[PDB]
Coordinates of C-alpha atoms and ligand atoms in Angstrom, one line a residue:
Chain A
X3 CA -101.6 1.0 -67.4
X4 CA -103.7 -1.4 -65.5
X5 CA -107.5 -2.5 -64.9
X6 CA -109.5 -4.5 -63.0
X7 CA -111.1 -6.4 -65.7
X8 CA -109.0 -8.5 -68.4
X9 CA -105.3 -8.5 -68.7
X10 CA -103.8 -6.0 -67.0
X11 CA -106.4 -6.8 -63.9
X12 CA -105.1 -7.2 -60.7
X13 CA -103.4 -10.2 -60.6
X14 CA -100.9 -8.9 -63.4
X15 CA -100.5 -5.6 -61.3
X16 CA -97.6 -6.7 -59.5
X17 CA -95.5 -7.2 -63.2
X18 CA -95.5 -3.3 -63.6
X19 CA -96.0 -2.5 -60.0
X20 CA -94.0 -4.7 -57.6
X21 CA -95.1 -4.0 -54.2
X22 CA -99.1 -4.8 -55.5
X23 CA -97.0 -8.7 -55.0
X24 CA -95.1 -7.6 -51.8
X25 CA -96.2 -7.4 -48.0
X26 CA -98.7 -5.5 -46.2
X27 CA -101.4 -5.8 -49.4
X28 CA -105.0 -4.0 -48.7
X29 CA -108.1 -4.7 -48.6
X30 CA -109.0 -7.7 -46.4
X31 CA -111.9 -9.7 -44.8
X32 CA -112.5 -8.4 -41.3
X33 CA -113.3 -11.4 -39.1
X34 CA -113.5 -12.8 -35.6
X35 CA -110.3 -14.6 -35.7
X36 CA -108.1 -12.4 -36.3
X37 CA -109.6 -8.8 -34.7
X38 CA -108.4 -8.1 -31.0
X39 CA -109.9 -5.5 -28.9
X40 CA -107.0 -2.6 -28.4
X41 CA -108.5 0.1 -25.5
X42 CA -105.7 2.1 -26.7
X43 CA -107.5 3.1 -30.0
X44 CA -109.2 6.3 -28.6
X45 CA -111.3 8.6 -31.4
X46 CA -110.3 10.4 -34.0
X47 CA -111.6 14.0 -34.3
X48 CA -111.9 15.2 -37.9
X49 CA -110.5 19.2 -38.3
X50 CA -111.3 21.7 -40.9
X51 CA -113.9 19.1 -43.0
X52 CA -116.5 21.6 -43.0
X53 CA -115.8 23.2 -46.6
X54 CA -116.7 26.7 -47.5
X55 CA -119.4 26.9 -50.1
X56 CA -117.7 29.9 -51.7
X57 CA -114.5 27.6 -52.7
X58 CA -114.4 25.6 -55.4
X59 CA -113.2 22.1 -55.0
X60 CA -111.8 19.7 -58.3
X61 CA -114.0 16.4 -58.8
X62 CA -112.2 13.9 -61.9
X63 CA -113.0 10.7 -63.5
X64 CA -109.0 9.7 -63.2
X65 CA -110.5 5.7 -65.3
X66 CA -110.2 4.1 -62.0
X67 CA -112.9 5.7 -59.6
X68 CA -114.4 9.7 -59.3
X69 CA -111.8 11.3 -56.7
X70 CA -112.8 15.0 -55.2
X71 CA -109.4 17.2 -54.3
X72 CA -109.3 17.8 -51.3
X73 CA -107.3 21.0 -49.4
X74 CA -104.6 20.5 -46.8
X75 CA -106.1 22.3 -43.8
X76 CA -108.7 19.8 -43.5
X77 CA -106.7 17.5 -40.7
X78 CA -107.0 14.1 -38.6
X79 CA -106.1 14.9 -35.3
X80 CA -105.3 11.9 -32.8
X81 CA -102.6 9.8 -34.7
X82 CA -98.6 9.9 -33.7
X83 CA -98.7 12.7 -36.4
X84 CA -101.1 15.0 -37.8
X85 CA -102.1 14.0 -41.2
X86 CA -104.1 16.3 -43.5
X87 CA -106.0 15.6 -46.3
X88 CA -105.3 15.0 -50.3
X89 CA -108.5 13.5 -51.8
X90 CA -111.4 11.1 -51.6
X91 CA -112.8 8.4 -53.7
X92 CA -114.5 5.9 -54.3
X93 CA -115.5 1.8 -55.1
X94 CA -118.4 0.0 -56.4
X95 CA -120.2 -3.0 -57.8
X96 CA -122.2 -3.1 -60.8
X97 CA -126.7 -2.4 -61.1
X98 CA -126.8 -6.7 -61.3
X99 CA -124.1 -7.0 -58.3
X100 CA -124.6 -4.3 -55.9
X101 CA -121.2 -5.2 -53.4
X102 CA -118.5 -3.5 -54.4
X103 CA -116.9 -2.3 -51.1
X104 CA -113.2 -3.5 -50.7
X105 CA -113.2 -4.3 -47.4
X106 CA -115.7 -7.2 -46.1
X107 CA -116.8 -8.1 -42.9
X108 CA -117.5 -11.8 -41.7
X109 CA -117.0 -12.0 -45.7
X110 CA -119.7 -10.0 -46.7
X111 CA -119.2 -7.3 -49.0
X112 CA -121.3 -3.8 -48.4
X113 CA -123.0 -2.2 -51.6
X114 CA -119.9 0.8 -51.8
X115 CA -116.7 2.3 -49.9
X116 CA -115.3 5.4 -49.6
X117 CA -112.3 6.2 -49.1
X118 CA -110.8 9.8 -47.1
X119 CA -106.9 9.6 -48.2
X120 CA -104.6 11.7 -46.0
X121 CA -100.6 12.3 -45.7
X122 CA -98.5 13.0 -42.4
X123 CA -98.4 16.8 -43.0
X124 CA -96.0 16.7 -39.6
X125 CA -93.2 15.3 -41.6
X126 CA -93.7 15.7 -45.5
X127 CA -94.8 18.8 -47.6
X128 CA -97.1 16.6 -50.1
X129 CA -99.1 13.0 -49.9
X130 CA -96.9 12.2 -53.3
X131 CA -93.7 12.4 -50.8
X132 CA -95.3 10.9 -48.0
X133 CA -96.8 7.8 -50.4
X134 CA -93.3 6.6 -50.1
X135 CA -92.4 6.1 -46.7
X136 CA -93.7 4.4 -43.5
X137 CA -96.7 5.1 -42.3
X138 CA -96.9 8.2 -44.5
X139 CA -100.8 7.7 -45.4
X140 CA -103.9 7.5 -43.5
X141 CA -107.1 6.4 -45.0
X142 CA -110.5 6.4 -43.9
X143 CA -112.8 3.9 -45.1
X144 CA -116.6 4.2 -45.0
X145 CA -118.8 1.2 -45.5
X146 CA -122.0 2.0 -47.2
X147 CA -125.1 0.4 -47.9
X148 CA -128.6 0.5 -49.1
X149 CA -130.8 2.9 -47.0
X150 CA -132.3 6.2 -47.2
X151 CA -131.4 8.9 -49.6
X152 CA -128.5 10.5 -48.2
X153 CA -128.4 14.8 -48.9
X154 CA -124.3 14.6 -48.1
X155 CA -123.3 12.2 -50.7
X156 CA -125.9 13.9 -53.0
X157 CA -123.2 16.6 -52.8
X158 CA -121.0 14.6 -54.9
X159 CA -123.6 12.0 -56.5
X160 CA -125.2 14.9 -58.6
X161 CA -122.0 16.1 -60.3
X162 CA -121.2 13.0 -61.9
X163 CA -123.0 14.1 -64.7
X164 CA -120.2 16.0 -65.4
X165 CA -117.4 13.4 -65.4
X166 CA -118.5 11.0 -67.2
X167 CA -115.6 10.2 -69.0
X168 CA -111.8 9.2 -68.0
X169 CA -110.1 12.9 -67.7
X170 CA -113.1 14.8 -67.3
X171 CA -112.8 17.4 -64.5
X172 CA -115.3 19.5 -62.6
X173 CA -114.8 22.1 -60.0
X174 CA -117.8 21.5 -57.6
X175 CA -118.5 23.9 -53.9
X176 CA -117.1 23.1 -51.0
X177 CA -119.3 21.2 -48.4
X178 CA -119.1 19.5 -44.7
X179 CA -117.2 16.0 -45.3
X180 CA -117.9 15.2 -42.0
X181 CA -121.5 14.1 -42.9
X182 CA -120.4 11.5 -45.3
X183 CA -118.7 9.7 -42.1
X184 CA -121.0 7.4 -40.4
X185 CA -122.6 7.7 -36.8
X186 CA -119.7 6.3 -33.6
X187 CA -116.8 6.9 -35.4
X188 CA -114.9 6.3 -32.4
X189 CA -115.7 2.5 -33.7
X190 CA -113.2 1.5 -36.2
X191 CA -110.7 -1.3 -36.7
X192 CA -107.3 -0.3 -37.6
X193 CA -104.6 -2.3 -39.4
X194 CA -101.3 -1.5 -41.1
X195 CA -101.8 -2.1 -44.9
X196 CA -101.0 -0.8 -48.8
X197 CA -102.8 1.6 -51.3
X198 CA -105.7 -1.0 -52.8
X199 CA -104.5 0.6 -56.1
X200 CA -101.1 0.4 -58.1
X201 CA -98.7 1.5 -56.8
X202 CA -100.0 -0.3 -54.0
X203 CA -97.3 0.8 -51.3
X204 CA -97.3 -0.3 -48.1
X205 CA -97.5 2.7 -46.2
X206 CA -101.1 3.3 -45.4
X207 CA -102.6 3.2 -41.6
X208 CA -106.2 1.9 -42.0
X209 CA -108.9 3.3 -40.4
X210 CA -111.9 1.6 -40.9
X211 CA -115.4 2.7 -39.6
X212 CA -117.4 -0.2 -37.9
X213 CA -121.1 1.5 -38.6
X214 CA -122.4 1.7 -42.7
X215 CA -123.6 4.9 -43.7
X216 CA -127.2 4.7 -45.7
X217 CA -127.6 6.1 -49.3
X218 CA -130.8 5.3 -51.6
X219 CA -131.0 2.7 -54.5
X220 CA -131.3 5.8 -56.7
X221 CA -128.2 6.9 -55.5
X222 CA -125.9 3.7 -55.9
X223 CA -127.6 3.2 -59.4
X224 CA -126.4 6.6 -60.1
X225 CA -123.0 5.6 -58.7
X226 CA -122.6 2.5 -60.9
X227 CA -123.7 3.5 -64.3
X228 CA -122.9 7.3 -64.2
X229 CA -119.2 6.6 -65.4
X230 CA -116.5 5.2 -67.9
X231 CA -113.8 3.6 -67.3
X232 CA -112.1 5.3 -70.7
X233 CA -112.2 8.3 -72.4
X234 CA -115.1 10.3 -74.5
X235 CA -113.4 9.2 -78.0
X236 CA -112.1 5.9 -76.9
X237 CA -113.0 2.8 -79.5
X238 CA -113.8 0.3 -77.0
X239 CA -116.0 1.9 -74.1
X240 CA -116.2 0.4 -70.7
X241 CA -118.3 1.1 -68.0
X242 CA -116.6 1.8 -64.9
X243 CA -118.0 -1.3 -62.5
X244 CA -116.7 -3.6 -60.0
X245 CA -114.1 -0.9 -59.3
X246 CA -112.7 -2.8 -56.4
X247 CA -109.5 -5.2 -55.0
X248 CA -109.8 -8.8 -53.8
X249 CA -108.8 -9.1 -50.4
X250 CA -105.7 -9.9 -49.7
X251 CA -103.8 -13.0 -47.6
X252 CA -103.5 -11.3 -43.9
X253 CA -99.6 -11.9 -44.0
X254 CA -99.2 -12.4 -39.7
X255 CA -101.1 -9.1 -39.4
X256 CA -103.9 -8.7 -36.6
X257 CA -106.6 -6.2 -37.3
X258 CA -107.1 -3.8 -33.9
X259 CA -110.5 -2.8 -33.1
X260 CA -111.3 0.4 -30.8
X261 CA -114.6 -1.9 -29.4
X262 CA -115.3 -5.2 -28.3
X263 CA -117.3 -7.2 -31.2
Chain B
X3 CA -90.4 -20.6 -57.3
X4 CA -93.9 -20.1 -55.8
X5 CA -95.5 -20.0 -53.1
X6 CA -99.0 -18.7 -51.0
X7 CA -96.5 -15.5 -48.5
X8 CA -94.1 -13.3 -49.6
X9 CA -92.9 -11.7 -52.9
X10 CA -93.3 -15.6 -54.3
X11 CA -97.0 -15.4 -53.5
X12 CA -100.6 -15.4 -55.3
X13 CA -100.0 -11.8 -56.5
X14 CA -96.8 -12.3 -58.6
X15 CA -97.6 -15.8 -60.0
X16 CA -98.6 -14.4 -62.9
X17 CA -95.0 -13.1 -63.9
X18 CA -93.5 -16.2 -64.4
X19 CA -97.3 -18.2 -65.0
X20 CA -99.0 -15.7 -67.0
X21 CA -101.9 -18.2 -67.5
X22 CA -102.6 -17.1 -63.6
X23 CA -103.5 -13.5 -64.8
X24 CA -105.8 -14.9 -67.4
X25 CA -109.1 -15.9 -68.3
X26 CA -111.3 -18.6 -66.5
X27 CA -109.6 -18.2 -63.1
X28 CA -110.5 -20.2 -59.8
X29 CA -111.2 -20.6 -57.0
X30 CA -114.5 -18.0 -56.7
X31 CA -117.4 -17.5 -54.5
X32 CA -120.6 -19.9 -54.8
X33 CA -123.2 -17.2 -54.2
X34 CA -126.6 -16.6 -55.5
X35 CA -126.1 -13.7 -57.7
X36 CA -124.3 -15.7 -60.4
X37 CA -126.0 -19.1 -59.6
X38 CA -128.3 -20.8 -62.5
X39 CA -130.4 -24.1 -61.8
X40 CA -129.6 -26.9 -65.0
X41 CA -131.6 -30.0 -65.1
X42 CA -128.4 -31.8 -67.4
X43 CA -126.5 -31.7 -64.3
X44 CA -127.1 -35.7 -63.7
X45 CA -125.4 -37.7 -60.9
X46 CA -121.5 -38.7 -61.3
X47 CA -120.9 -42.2 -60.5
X48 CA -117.4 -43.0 -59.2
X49 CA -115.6 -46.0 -60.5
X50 CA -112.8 -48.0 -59.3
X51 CA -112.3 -45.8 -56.2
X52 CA -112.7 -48.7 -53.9
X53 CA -108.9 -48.8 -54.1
X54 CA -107.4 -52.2 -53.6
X55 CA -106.0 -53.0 -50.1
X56 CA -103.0 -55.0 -51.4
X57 CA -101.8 -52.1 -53.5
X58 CA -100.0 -49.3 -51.9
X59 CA -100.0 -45.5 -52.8
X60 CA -97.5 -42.8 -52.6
X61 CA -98.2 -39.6 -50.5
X62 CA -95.4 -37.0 -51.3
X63 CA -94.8 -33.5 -49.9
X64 CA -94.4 -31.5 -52.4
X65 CA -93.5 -28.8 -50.9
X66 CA -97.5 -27.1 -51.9
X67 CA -99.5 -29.8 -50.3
X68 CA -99.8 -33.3 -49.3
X69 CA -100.6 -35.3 -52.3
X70 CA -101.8 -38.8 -52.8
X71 CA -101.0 -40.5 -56.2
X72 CA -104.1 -42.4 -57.6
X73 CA -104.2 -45.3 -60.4
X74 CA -105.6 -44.6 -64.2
X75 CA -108.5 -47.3 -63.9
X76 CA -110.2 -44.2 -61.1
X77 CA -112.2 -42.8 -63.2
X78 CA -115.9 -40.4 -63.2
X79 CA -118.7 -41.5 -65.5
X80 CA -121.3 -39.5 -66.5
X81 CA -119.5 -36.3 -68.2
X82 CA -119.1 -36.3 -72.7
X83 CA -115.8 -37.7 -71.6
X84 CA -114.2 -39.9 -69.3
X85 CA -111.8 -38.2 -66.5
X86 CA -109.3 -40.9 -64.8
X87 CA -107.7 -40.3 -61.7
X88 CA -104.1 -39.0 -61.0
X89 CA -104.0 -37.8 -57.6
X90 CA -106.2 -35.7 -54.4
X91 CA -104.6 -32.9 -52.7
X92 CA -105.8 -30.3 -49.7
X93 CA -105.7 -26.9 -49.1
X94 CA -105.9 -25.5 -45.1
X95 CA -105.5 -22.6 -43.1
X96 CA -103.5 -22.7 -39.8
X97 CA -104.6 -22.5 -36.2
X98 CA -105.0 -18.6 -35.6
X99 CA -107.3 -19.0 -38.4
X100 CA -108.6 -21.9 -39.4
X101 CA -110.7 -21.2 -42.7
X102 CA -108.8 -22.2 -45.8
X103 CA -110.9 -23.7 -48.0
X104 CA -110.3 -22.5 -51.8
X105 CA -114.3 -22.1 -52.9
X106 CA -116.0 -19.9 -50.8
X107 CA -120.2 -20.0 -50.5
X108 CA -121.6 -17.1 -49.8
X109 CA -118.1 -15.4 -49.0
X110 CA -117.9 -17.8 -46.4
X111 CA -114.3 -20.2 -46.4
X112 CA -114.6 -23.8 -45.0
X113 CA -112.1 -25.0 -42.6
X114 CA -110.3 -27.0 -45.7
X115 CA -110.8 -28.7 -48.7
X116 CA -110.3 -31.9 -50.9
X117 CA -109.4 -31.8 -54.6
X118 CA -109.5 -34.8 -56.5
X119 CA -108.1 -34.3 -59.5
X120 CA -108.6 -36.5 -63.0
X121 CA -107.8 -35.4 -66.3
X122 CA -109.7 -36.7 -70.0
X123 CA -108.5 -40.0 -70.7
X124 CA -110.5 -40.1 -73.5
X125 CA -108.5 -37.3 -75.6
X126 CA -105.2 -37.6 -73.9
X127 CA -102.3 -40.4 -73.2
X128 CA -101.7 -38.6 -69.2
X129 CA -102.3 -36.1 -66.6
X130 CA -99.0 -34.2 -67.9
X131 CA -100.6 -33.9 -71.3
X132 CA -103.7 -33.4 -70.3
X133 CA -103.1 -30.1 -68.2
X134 CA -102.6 -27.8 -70.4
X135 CA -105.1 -28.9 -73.2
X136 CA -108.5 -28.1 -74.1
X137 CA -110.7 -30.0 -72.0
X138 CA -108.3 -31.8 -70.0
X139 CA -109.1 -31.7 -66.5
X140 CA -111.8 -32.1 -64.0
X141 CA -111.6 -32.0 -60.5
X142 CA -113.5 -32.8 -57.5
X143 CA -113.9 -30.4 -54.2
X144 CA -115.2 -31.5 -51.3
X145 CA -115.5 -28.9 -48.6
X146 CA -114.2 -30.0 -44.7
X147 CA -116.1 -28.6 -41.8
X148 CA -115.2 -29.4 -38.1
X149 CA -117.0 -32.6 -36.2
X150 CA -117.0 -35.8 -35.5
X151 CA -113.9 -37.9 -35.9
X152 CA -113.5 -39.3 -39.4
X153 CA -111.5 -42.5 -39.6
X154 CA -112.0 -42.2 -43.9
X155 CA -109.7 -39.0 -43.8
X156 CA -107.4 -40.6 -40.8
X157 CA -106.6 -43.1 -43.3
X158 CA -104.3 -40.2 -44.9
X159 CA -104.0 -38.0 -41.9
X160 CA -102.4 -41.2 -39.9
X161 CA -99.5 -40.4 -42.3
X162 CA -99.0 -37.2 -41.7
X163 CA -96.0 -37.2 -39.6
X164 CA -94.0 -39.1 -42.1
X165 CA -93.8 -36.2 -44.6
X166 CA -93.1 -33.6 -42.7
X167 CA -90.3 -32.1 -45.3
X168 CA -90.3 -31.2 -48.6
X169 CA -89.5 -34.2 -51.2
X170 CA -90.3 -36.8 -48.4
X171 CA -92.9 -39.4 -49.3
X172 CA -94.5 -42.3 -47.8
X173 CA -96.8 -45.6 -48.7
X174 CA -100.1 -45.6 -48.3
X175 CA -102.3 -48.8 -48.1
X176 CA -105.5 -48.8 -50.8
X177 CA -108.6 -48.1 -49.6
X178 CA -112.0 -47.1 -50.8
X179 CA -111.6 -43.2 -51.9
X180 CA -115.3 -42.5 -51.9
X181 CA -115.5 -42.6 -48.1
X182 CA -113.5 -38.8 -48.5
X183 CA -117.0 -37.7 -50.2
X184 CA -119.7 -36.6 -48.8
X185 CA -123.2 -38.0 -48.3
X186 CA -125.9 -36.5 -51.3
X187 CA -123.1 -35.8 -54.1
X188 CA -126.1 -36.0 -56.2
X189 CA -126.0 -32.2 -55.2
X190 CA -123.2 -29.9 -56.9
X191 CA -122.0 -26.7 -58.5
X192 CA -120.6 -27.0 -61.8
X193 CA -118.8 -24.0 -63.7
X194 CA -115.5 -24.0 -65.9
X195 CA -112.2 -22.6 -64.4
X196 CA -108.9 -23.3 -63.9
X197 CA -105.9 -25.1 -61.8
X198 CA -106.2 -23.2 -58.7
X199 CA -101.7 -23.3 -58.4
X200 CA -99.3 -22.5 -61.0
X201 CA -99.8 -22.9 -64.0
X202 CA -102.8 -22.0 -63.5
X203 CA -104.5 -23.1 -66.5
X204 CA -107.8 -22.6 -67.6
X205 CA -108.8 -26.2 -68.4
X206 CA -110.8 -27.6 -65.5
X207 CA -114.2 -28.3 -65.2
X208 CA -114.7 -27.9 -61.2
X209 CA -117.9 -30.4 -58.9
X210 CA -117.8 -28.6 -56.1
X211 CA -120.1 -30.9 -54.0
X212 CA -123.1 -28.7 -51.7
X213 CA -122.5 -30.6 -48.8
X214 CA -119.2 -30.9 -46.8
X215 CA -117.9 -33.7 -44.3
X216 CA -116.7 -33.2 -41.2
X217 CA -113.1 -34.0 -39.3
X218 CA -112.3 -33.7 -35.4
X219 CA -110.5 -30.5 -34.3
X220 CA -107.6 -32.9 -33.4
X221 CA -107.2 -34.2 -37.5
X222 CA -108.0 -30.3 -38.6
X223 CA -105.3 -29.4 -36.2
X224 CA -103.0 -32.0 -37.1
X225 CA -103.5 -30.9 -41.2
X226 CA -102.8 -27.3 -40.2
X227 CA -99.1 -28.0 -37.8
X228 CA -97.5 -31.1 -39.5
X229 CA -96.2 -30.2 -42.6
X230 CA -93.0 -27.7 -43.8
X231 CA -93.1 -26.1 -47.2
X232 CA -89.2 -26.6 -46.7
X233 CA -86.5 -29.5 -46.8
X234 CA -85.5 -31.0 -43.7
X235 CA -81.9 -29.2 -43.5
X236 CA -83.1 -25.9 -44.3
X237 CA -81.6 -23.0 -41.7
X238 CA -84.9 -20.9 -41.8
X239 CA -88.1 -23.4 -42.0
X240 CA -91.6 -22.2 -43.4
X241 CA -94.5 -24.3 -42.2
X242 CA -97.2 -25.4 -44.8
X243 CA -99.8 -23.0 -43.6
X244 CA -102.7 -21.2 -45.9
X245 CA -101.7 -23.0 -49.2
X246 CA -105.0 -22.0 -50.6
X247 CA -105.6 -19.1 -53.4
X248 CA -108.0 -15.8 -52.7
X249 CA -110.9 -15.8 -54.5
X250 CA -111.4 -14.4 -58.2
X251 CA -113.2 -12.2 -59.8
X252 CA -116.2 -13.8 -61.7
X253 CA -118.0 -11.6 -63.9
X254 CA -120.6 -11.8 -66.5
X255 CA -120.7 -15.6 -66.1
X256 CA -122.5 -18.6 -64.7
X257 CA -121.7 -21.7 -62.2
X258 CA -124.7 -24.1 -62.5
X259 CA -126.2 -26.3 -60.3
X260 CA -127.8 -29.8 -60.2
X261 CA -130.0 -28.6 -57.7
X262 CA -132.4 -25.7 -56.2
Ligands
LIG1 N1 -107.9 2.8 -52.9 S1 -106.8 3.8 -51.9 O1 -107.5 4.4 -50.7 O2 -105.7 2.8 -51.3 C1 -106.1 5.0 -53.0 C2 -105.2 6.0 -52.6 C3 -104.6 6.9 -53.6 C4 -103.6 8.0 -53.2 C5 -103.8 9.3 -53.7 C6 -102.9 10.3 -53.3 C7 -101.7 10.0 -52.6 C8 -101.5 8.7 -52.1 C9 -102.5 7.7 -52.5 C10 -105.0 6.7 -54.9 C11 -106.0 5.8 -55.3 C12 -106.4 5.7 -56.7 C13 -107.7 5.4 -57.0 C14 -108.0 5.3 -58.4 C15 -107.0 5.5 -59.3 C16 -105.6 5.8 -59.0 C17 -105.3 5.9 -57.6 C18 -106.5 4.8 -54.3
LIG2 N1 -105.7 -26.9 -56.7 S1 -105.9 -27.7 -58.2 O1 -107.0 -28.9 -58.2 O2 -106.5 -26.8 -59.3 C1 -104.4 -28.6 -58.6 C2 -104.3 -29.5 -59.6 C3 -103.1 -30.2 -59.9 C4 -102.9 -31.2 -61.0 C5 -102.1 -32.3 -60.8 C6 -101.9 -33.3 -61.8 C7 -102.5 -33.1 -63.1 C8 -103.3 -31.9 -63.3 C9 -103.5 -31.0 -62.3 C10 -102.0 -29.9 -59.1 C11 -102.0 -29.0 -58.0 C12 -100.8 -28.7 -57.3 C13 -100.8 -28.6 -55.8 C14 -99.6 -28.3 -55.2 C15 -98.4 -28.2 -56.0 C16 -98.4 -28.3 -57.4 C17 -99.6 -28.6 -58.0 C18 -103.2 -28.3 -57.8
LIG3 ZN1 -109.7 3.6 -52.5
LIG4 ZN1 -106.2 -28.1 -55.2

């Protein structure tokens, strides 16, 4: 059991969990001294995002974020190895603190992040193998901030209804995932780090997209007081806010970025 | 034991220092979403830090930081107690990256930072007591920006090569502390959180002056490349690089500011 609030918060993670205390730890600041231009970062192309209407698809309030199953034939195609996907999810602040991205940039936080988890399908039959060994996970991280309303994320947004509660489920339709990716997405920075959760391995390749996508203040209200940390019956409720990791010591590492500032 | 890289770092201090995954943490970031104007926020007045010439002071490596010891009769007036000096430390970055100040204003990281730490002399007999009691500490931050040279801060920096190992020390000749602070410390933040290294206890009340000073790249760089975390004789050195702690989480709660 851990948190990010109180005692078993994130800096008693690693007691339970010892690599959230070992090398490699995500998410970090993204700033000028430590990015470097890499021309060999070409785009990604995303395969098989565009998900039939007619399938069903399982959204869950696991007490840590919302997370939306996601099948294995949708792919990302320009790594060493395909990887395909497993789920998505995502982080956030609180109505009164509205920053709650994991990643920052010039140590700004954006208002949200998602996050597109994905396993090297090439090599191992499941992401719970692949979570285990080097470079076995890929994750794509959207920024997002304040903007217009935004129909894609509406297309998980308006189901939370329906999770409100740690270890409520909903199957929801199938829709295109590529529009929750921003526009350029051949801008990114890329980094070896960790899962941002417990059992925070490090054995995720980092992908993260230089451009915000825009959702409304309606939206992100809906996103930060839609859901509970615990479940329905549970004698001390909590709100699930602020839903996000420090950033972590860089640790030598260099962040790589596909573009030049 | 612990240290700021590796499986001895920031993450698993709270293992052996459980404090560390407590309440009350710092360092955190000064922004405006948790900021609150407070008019009882008066201006500290700094006694006894002309230090006397003919006295000498000892700088140690500890291994953490470079630490200065400083006499009992140091003291800060103006809070319901008195805090008397024991000793200033810093905390850097390191060349590739030289932002490694511990407070943060508006998620932005100084190049370094000065911590001048006293504890309450009016409830406790010393420092040692004092740490890990209610009320017992206050500390001083002074935020270090690059430019112009700074002969105040040379007057420790000048040292620097003489305590290059862990456990070596060196004399100091007294001098008037308050030069280290900036211009305008009428102007501060003010919350309650804790020692900011192992133990980690929730017992200081933090001044983190607005306004930093400034040193030449040459004493920054010279902070950043002459120290070792490790004894002389040791086969696989570690230089004493990024000895400052991420930022907390700070939620539901107030730092509070002399000024607006
Ligand atoms: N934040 S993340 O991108 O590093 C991440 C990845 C995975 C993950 C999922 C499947 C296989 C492998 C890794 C799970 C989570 C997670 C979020 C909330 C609660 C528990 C876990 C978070
Ligand atoms: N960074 S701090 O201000 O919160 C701090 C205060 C004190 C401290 C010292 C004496 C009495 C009471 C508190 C000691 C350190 C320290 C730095 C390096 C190694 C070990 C300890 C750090
Ligand atoms: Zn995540
Ligand atoms: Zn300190």
């Amino acid at each position: 059991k851990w948190t990010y609030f109180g005692p078993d918060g994130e800096n008693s993670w690693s007691k339970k969990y010892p690599s959230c205390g070992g090398l490699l730890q995500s998410p970090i600041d993204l700033h000028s001294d430590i990015l470097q231009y890499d021309a060999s970062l070409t785009p990604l192309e995303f395969q098989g995002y565009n998900l039939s209407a007619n399938k069903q698809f399982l959204l869950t309030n696991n007490g840590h974020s919302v997370k939306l199953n996601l099948p294995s034939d949708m792919h990302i195609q320009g790594l060493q190895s395909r990887y395909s996907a497993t789920q998505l999810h995502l982080h956030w602040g609180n109505p009164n603190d509205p920053h709650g991205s994991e990643h920052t940039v010039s140590g700004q936080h954006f208002a949200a992040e998602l996050h597109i988890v994905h396993y090297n399908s090439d090599l191992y039959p499941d992401a719970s193998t692949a979570s285990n060994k080097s470079e076995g996970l890929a994750v794509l991280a959207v920024l997002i901030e304040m903007g217009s309303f935004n129909p894609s994320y509406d297309k998980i947004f308006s189901h939370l209804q329906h999770v409100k509660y740690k270890g409520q489920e909903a199957f929801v339709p199938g829709f295109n995932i590529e529009e929750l990716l921003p526009e350029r997405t051949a801008e990114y920075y890329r980094y070896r780090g960790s899962l941002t959760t417990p059992p925070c391995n490090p054995t995720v390749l980092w992908t993260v997209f230089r451009n915000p996508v825009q959702i409304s203040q309606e939206q992100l209200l809906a996103l930060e007081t839609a859901l509970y940390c615990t479940h329905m019956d549970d004698p001390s409720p909590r709100e699930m806010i602020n839903n996000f990791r420090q950033v972590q010591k860089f640790d030598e590492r260099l962040v790589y970025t596909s573009f030049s500032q």
